[PDB]
Ligand binder design. Structure first.
Ligand SMILES: C[C@@H](NS(C)(=O)=O)c1ccccc1Cl
Length: 185
């Protein structure tokens, strides 16, 4: 791909984070804590899952960023509507306002309803995410494999401002403590 020139500097929004997340001082890294991180509750926080949003809101244009997923066993990445549900149980789908891919139990899948199997020959250590608001496109790229395409959601019905979306995943196994990191431009 040649989308690199639409690079945007994403930072994480502490106020949206699940209460067990630890966001770095620079707001560019997030990981699972081993307990509640001693914050007040609020209506923005994802309650059921280890999720957080970027601070940036996008309603037009072309945007690109990259995320480091090195040595994680489970995560979700993409974009979502600013108005997505925060509390209780929900599935990641375009009907619920999410355009995402994930790693879970040694397979990669796109968050369609029902989910779509991804075909990745080189397990990625860094993921590129491209959003074209006007075109209704969200695309995912394998930076480890020379930028190869992972998945394109097209005919997207955003229906509102978009936010970068992250899930560090559970760490029941003791093998998923590593952070998500926003990679430098
Ligand atoms: C299960 C728990 N911690 S962990 C490290 O994954 O065992 C958790 C932490 C944050 C949100 C939901 C849940 Cl369920």
């Amino acid at each position: 791909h040649h989308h690199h020139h639409h690079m945007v500097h994403i930072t994480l929004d502490r106020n949206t984070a699940n209460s067990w997340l630890i966001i770095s001082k620079d707001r560019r890294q997030v990981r699972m804590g081993d307990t509640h991180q001693n914050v007040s509750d609020n209506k923005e926080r994802f309650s059921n899952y280890p999720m957080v949003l970027g601070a940036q809101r996008f309603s037009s244009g072309k945007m690109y960023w990259e995320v480091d997923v090195t040595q994680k066993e489970a995560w979700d990445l993409g974009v979502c509507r600013d108005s997505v549900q925060r509390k209780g149980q929900f599935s990641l789908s375009p009907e619920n306002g999410f355009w995402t891919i994930w790693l879970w139990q040694d397979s990669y899948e796109a968050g369609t309803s029902p989910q779509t199997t991804l075909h990745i020959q080189v397990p990625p250590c860094q993921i590129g995410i491209f959003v074209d608001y006007e075109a209704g496109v969200v695309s995912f790229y394998n930076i480890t494999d020379h930028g190869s395409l992972i998945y394109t959601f097209s005919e997207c019905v955003f229906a509102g401002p978009l936010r970068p979306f992250f899930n560090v995943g559970f760490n029941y196994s003791g093998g998923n403590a590593a952070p998500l990191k926003l990679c430098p431009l």
